[PDB]
């Protein structure tokens, strides 16, 4: 069974020494304040239900969580131990210790926490005690922690905090251009009790071998590892089960005679594991077992949803990813952190993987800058079929090449390669970066404990020849700015504040704008990130309206049709172009950003016209001076037939209308257009297998009118001008 | 996979000239790459280098194996504490195409079953065991025959390694005999010939191939295996077979579907001169007589003998320095008739039947 320790726990904070606290006596003896904290949690989150802080999400509160950053947190509760039989094992789990913390027992130190992101797990089965035994964690200053290392020259004036350098958290959290600072701490993932038998699971290593997707067969192979006493030897018997809706594929038993075996799986009538339009996600239920062969005793039994499916990056002699030996064209977001208080991730994690889901993402990369996501995140991209690029957590920044480091990358890179290892969705390992981290460190682990990956050690106006002319087959990162809903304005803003001119004064922004553009720390300066929304719209529109609405529709229109052009653009010149990440999908913040869509979920005017151009197949065109290139392209396996109709929309002239056949995998011209006269927009329809779809170009040069644009938008009857 | 020899060893091989190629522990398998291992590996190589970096047989150390432990843990401690010698990371039918097309100048590891001598058997064999047909079918293994194959862990089962036997015997003569005195000569006959091909095909095909490396010489335990000497010191019918194709210099006959291309290879820094005498066994008509000249460190070409008809053995008889030297080719294709060449073999007058 598996005790959880979440709930109500003590939580006493205090300003941290010189000497930081170590031990209890000194945390009970420290001159502090007790509050009622929830774990999971954040600190800040307890202290705002307490009253002790004010709501960091409106706006310049967030500059009020600093000294906090220089504090230590003891948390402290009371469990019960269950009764052990003699062999067994009690763990305690801790799934997140934001960050450097010492763990005791029953007054007895079990382990000291320095890793935010990965999982640390104690074994208390000699120190507990019979009935209510004491469980306390005493954090100190993460902040503080980064002056007991010397800093080499490049891990200085990076982008990234000097504080993050040494230490290992998410870089994210000390500040950047799209996440607040708010360092933070605090047990923000789930604390359990497990019992463990003798015999019990260490790991099981699901990897496919090879799939057959026409012929419905694959190989699987289970590198299982266990616990075994030696008198359990020839006496424990491995039962396997592959299942789908409850229905049995196939079962194997096999004797223990050793504790680490390979059990290859040859499976028939199993179906293969596709990302988004390239097939369905066919996930199936893989379960392993140690059961005695006399009693039928089962020891211990791990079960997760597997996916048959290969994977090969192909780099161009600039790479195109083979999912299941067919070339992938990979269209989706970058991930950023869901909260600023990561122990809320989990209550986002749902309805953010919606936001792909309707998007028709088949693909995700985890930015580096954030932690990394827990299990049911990869369980959701398993079987909505969305490959997953996971960046080990470096952010913008040079590291160490020192031993210490070495050794807790390493660490920390083991532990996340097990725990992500078996999702399907999961294709690709990033340094996100000569250097001993990207290329000897990261690349030797997955060297032993996931050969079956790629590992890579490195990753104005829209229609300008830098963005147009960029060589790359697969871009990675690339984003315009975009002006949140006026809903999210008014919620995030001082009343006086919402309209961003201060003064009236066009361009000139308020102090609460310039703080969640986002200034990390509260320094009072003009410009800077914020312009960028401005000389944004000044470009396509001519000038900066001074009606905030009017502002608010032109600077998510500038967003809209640059974001869209640039996937049109990566579609309609395949084969060459092979993938396209833009960013970002989601904020973890109330901010002004180049997302698409906000914290509360507000969804900008470029969220509608990105997930026009995401079909899976869609018609599109493409600039020529010639005119305009009517396209279609397919990111499936399959051929789709349809009709597809464009007229003007300001004189409702019809400029085209015929059928056309979508080859799969592919994209394929349907005509050339005749270039209309000035500017305008032309409207796209076309019906596909009895499902009406809608797209458009807007053609002409900038500057546009945005009264006129507004109009043709409203016309073109596809987004409402909200 | 065998740990590391003691000092005697190395004292037996110096006197006697036998060069030493030496892997460092560690078998068919991919090991850690972590700082534990490393460090574990690196004081054993380096004790095990100290220890033996100065005997003159040996000549090479070896990863038997991007990799930490062959490509730096290893390469390391041979770089610092013995420079002197190099450091190597890594390493049917006999006359099928992939044994004798393989563009390998030296082939490290090669090798035939064969079944043990009758006193072998009946030592290691329980006496109702020592039979392998279990109920007298041809072709089933009774537990214990199936235990020595070797089965590592006491799983029952049919087949698997020791139908390696049966399968190489059914192809040379056609037929697995019922009888165990003739399956024990028909295995070890197949071994015998088949390590004997190999050894004169590297040998006559210098000096492209620069060496042979075949696998074994002898047993560690009362087992069924591809060597040709068991624990207990019984010599299997390829021992006699290799030891008259391993001479300093050698007489053999190479195939061609033009016939039979007598040569003399030559393993030393002297040059030899002799008489050979080759003579169809079954008719006993002389095929070939006369001198040869055999340069030093080199094969030389002696003749091109006729080619016979249907299936057959010749006998290679020379003189070298007073000294008579004996050898044999088996010519034909298979499947052969087992006891057609056992009569060979007797009158052949080199190797007895036992």
Same mark, same amino acid.
């Given at each position: 069974s598996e005790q959880s320790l979440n709930g109500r726990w003590t939580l006493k904070f205090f300003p941290q020494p010189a000497v930081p606290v170590m031990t209890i006596e000194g945390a009970e003896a420290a001159n502090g304040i007790v509050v009622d904290a929830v774990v999971p949690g954040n600190v800040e989150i307890d202290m705002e239900a307490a009253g002790l802080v004010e709501d960091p999400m409106v706006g310049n509160n967030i500059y009020k969580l600093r000294p906090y950053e220089g504090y230590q947190w003891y948390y402290s509760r009371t469990f019960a131990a269950p009764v052990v039989t003699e062999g067994q094992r009690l763990v305690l789990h801790f799934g997140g210790i934001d960050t450097f913390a010492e763990v005791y027992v029953n007054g007895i130190k079990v382990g000291s926490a320095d890793n935010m992101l990965i999982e640390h797990d104690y074994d208390i089965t000699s120190v507990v005690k019979e009935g209510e035994n004491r469980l306390d964690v005493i954090i100190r200053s993460s902040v503080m922690e980064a002056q007991n290392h010397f800093l080499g020259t490049l891990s200085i004036g990076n982008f990234s905090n000097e504080e993050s350098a040494p230490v290992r958290r998410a870089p994210s959290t000390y500040g950047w251009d799209i996440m607040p600072r708010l360092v933070s701490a605090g047990l923000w993932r789930d604390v359990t009790l497990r019992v463990e038998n003798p015999v019990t699971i260490v790991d099981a290593n699901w990897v496919t071998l090879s799939v057959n997707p026409k012929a419905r067969e694959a190989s699987e192979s289970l590198y299982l590892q266990t616990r075994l006493p030696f008198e359990m030897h020839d006496k424990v018997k491995a039962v396997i089960t592959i299942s789908r809706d409850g229905r049995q594929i196939l079962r194997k038993e096999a004797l223990m005679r050793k504790f680490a075996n390979l059990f290859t799986l040859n499976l028939s009538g199993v179906d293969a594991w596709w990302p988004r339009g390239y097939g369905e996600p066919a996930l199936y239920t893989a379960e392993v077992s140690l059961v005695d062969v006399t009693s039928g005793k089962i020891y211990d039994t791990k079960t997760s949803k597997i996916g048959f499916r290969t994977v090969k990056l192909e780099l161009d002699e600039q790479f195109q990813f083979i999912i299941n030996g067919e070339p992938v064209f990979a269209k989706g977001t970058n991930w950023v952190p869901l909260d600023a208080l990561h122990s809320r991730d989990a209550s986002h994690v749902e309805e953010a993987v919606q936001l792909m889901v309707e998007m028709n993402c088949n693909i995700v990369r985890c930015w580096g800058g954030n932690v990394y996501e827990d299990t049911h995140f990869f369980e959701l991209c398993d079987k909505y079929g969305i490959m997953v690029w996971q960046d080990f957590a470096m952010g913008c920044g040079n590291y160490s090449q020192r031993d210490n480091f070495a050794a807790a990358l390493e660490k920390e890179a083991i532990s996340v390669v097990v725990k992500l290892r078996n999702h399907p969705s999961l294709i690709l390992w990033s340094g996100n970066n000569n250097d001993r981290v990207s290329r000897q460190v990261l690349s030797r682990v997955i060297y032993e404990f996931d050969p079956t990956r790629p590992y890579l050690p490195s990753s104005g106006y829209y229609k300008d020849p830098f963005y147009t002319e960029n060589? =790359?087959?697969? /871009? =990675?990162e690339i984003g315009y700015h975009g002006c949140p809903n006026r809903e999210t304005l008014e919620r995030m803003f001082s009343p006086d504040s919402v309209n961003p001119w201060q003064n009236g004064v066009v361009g000139m922004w308020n102090d609460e704008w310039q703080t969640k553009a986002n200034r990390i720390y509260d320094d009072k300066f003009q410009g800077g990130r914020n312009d960028l929304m401005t000389n944004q719209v000044r470009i396509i529109f001519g000038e900066v309206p001074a009606d905030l609405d009017d502002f608010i529709f032109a600077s998510q229109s500038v967003q809209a049709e640059a974001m869209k052009f640039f996937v049109e653009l990566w579609r309609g010149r395949r084969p060459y172009r092979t993938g396209i990440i833009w960013w970002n999908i989601r904020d973890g913040w109330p901010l002004l950003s180049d #997302?698409?869509?906000?914290?509360?979920g507000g969804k900008k005017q470029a969220f509608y016209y990105m997930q026009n151009v995401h079909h899976d197949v869609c018609c599109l065109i493409n600039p020529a001076a010639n005119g305009y290139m009517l396209k279609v392209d397919n990111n499936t396996l399959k051929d789709f037939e349809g009709v597809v109709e464009v007229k003007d /929309? #300001? =004189?409702?002239?019809?400029v085209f209308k015929g059928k056309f056949v979508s080859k799969a995998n592919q994209m394929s011209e349907i005509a050339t257009l005749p270039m209309q006269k000035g500017q305008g927009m032309l409207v796209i329809s076309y019906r596909i297998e009895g499902n009406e779809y809608f797209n458009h170009y807007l053609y002409g040069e900038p500057p546009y009118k945005l009264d006129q644009y507004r109009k043709w938008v409203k016309k073109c009857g596809i987004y409402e001008l909200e």
């Open positions: 060589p =790359s087959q697969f /871009v =990675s #997302a698409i869509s906000d914290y509360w /929309v #300001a =004189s409702g002239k019809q």
